[PDB]
Coordinates of all heavy atoms in Angstrom, one line a residue:
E15 N 46.6 -53.0 3.7 CA 45.3 -53.0 3.1 C 44.2 -53.2 4.2 O 44.3 -54.1 5.0 CB 45.3 -54.2 2.1 CG 43.9 -54.2 1.3 CD 43.9 -55.3 0.2 OE1 45.1 -55.7 -0.2 OE2 42.8 -55.6 -0.3
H16 N 43.3 -52.3 4.2 CA 42.3 -52.3 5.2 C 41.0 -52.9 4.6 O 40.7 -53.0 3.4 CB 42.0 -50.9 5.7 CG 41.4 -50.0 4.6 ND1 40.1 -49.8 4.4 CD2 42.1 -49.3 3.7 CE1 39.9 -49.0 3.3 NE2 41.1 -48.7 2.9
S17 N 40.1 -53.3 5.6 CA 38.8 -53.7 5.2 C 37.9 -53.3 6.4 O 38.3 -53.3 7.6 CB 38.7 -55.2 4.9 OG 39.4 -56.0 5.8
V18 N 36.6 -53.0 6.1 CA 35.6 -52.8 7.1 C 34.3 -53.4 6.7 O 33.9 -53.5 5.5 CB 35.3 -51.2 7.2 CG1 35.0 -50.6 5.9 CG2 34.2 -51.0 8.3
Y19 N 33.7 -54.1 7.7 CA 32.4 -54.9 7.4 C 31.4 -54.5 8.5 O 31.7 -54.6 9.7 CB 32.7 -56.4 7.5 CG 33.8 -56.9 6.5 CD1 35.2 -57.0 6.9 CD2 33.4 -57.2 5.3 CE1 36.1 -57.5 6.0 CE2 34.4 -57.7 4.4 CZ 35.7 -57.8 4.7 OH 36.7 -58.2 3.8
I20 N 30.2 -54.1 8.1 CA 29.2 -53.8 8.9 C 28.1 -54.9 8.9 O 27.8 -55.4 7.9 CB 28.5 -52.4 8.5 CG1 29.6 -51.4 8.4 CG2 27.4 -52.0 9.6 CD1 30.6 -51.4 9.5
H21 N 27.6 -55.2 10.1 CA 26.5 -56.1 10.2 C 25.3 -55.8 9.3 O 24.9 -54.6 9.3 CB 26.1 -56.4 11.7 CG 25.2 -57.5 12.0 ND1 23.8 -57.4 11.8 CD2 25.4 -58.7 12.4 CE1 23.3 -58.5 12.1 NE2 24.2 -59.4 12.5
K22 N 24.7 -56.8 8.7 CA 23.5 -56.5 7.8 C 22.4 -55.8 8.5 O 21.5 -55.3 7.8 CB 23.1 -57.8 7.2 CG 22.3 -58.7 8.1 CD 22.0 -60.1 7.5 CE 21.2 -61.0 8.5
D23 N 22.4 -55.7 9.8 CA 21.3 -55.1 10.6 C 21.6 -53.6 11.0 O 20.7 -53.0 11.5 CB 20.9 -55.9 11.8 CG 19.9 -57.1 11.3 OD1 19.3 -57.0 10.3 OD2 19.8 -58.1 12.1
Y24 N 22.9 -53.3 10.8 CA 23.2 -51.9 11.3 C 23.9 -51.0 10.2 O 24.6 -50.1 10.5 CB 24.2 -52.1 12.5 CG 23.5 -52.8 13.7 CD1 23.5 -54.1 13.8 CD2 22.9 -52.0 14.6 CE1 22.8 -54.7 14.8 CE2 22.2 -52.6 15.7 CZ 22.1 -54.0 15.8 OH 21.5 -54.6 16.8
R25 N 23.4 -51.3 9.0 CA 24.0 -50.4 7.8 C 23.2 -49.1 7.6 O 22.1 -48.9 8.2 CB 23.8 -51.2 6.5 CG 24.3 -52.7 6.7 CD 25.1 -53.1 5.4 NE 25.8 -54.4 5.8 CZ 25.6 -55.5 5.1 NH1 24.7 -55.6 4.2 NH2 26.3 -56.6 5.5
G26 N 23.8 -48.1 7.0 CA 23.2 -46.9 6.7 C 23.1 -46.0 8.0 O 22.2 -45.2 8.1
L27 N 24.0 -46.2 8.9 CA 24.0 -45.5 10.1 C 25.4 -44.7 10.3 O 25.5 -43.9 11.2 CB 23.8 -46.3 11.4 CG 22.7 -47.4 11.3 CD1 22.5 -48.2 12.6 CD2 21.4 -46.8 10.8
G28 N 26.2 -44.9 9.4 CA 27.6 -44.3 9.4 C 28.6 -45.1 10.2 O 29.7 -44.6 10.3
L29 N 28.3 -46.3 10.4 CA 29.3 -47.1 11.2 C 30.7 -47.3 10.4 O 31.7 -47.3 11.0 CB 28.8 -48.5 11.7 CG 27.9 -48.4 12.9 CD1 27.4 -49.7 13.3 CD2 28.7 -47.7 14.0
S30 N 30.5 -47.5 9.1 CA 31.7 -47.7 8.2 C 32.6 -46.5 8.4 O 33.8 -46.7 8.6 CB 31.3 -47.8 6.8 OG 31.0 -49.1 6.4
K31 N 32.1 -45.3 8.4 CA 32.9 -44.1 8.5 C 33.6 -44.0 9.9 O 34.7 -43.7 9.9 CB 31.9 -42.9 8.2 CG 32.6 -41.6 8.5 CD 31.7 -40.3 8.2
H32 N 32.8 -44.2 10.9 CA 33.4 -44.1 12.3 C 34.5 -45.2 12.5 O 35.5 -44.9 13.2 CB 32.3 -44.2 13.3 CG 31.5 -43.0 13.4 ND1 30.2 -42.9 12.7 CD2 31.7 -41.8 14.0 CE1 29.7 -41.7 13.0 NE2 30.6 -41.0 13.7
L33 N 34.2 -46.4 12.1 CA 35.3 -47.4 12.2 C 36.6 -47.1 11.4 O 37.7 -47.2 11.8 CB 34.7 -48.8 11.8 CG 34.0 -49.5 12.8 CD1 33.2 -50.7 12.3 CD2 35.1 -50.0 13.9
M34 N 36.3 -46.6 10.2 CA 37.5 -46.2 9.3 C 38.3 -45.1 9.9 O 39.5 -45.2 10.0 CB 36.9 -45.7 7.9 CG 36.7 -46.9 6.9 SD 38.1 -48.0 6.7 CE 39.3 -46.8 6.1
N35 N 37.6 -44.0 10.5 CA 38.4 -43.0 11.2 C 39.2 -43.5 12.4 O 40.3 -43.1 12.6 CB 37.4 -41.9 11.7 CG 37.1 -41.0 10.6 OD1 37.9 -40.7 9.7 ND2 35.9 -40.4 10.6
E36 N 38.6 -44.6 13.0 CA 39.3 -45.2 14.2 C 40.6 -46.0 13.7 O 41.5 -46.0 14.3 CB 38.4 -46.1 15.0 CG 38.9 -46.6 16.4 CD 39.2 -45.4 17.3 OE1 38.7 -44.2 17.1 OE2 40.0 -45.6 18.3
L37 N 40.3 -46.7 12.5 CA 41.5 -47.4 11.9 C 42.5 -46.4 11.4 O 43.7 -46.7 11.5 CB 41.0 -48.3 10.9 CG 41.8 -49.4 10.3 CD1 42.1 -50.4 11.4 CD2 41.2 -50.0 9.0
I38 N 42.1 -45.3 10.9 CA 43.0 -44.3 10.4 C 43.9 -43.8 11.5 O 45.1 -43.7 11.4 CB 42.3 -43.2 9.6 CG1 41.7 -43.7 8.3 CG2 43.3 -42.1 9.2 CD1 40.8 -42.8 7.6
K39 N 43.2 -43.5 12.6 CA 44.0 -43.1 13.9 C 45.0 -44.2 14.3 O 46.2 -43.8 14.5 CB 43.1 -42.8 15.0 CG 42.2 -41.6 14.9 CD 41.4 -41.4 16.3 CE 42.3 -41.0 17.5 NZ 43.0 -42.1 18.0
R40 N 44.6 -45.4 14.4 CA 45.4 -46.5 14.6 C 46.6 -46.6 13.7 O 47.7 -47.0 14.1 CB 44.7 -47.8 14.8 CG 45.5 -49.0 15.2 CD 45.9 -49.1 16.7 NE 44.7 -48.7 17.4 CZ 43.8 -49.6 17.9 NH1 44.1 -50.9 17.9 NH2 42.8 -49.1 18.6
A41 N 46.4 -46.4 12.4 CA 47.4 -46.4 11.4 C 48.5 -45.4 11.7 O 49.7 -45.7 11.6 CB 46.9 -46.2 10.0
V42 N 48.1 -44.2 12.0 CA 49.0 -43.1 12.3 C 49.9 -43.5 13.4 O 51.0 -43.3 13.5 CB 48.3 -41.8 12.7 CG1 49.3 -40.8 13.1 CG2 47.5 -41.3 11.4
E43 N 49.2 -44.2 14.5 CA 49.9 -44.6 15.7 C 50.8 -45.7 15.4 O 51.8 -45.9 16.2 CB 48.8 -45.0 16.7 CG 48.0 -43.9 17.3 CD 46.8 -44.3 18.1 OE1 46.7 -45.4 18.5 OE2 45.9 -43.4 18.4
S44 N 50.6 -46.5 14.3 CA 51.4 -47.7 14.1 C 52.4 -47.4 13.1 O 53.1 -48.3 12.6 CB 50.5 -48.9 13.6 OG 49.5 -49.2 14.6

């Protein structure tokens, strides 16, 4: 089960999406 948390000052920039993609890559790898 994954979770992603963005700092209250850095929202609406797409960071959630980029982190999720990096976690998805790591999942494939694991």
Side-chain angles (χ1 to χ4, degrees), residues 15-21 23-30 32-44:
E15 181 175 343
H16 62 96
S17 43
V18 54
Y19 301 96
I20 309 314
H21 189 274
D23 280 337
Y24 297 86
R25 318 220 166 116
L27 318 182
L29 276 183
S30 277
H32 289 95
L33 275 167
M34 276 308 298
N35 279 327
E36 190 64 16
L37 194 68
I38 296 167
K39 286 184 71 286
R40 181 79 42 96
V42 174
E43 288 168 16
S44 307

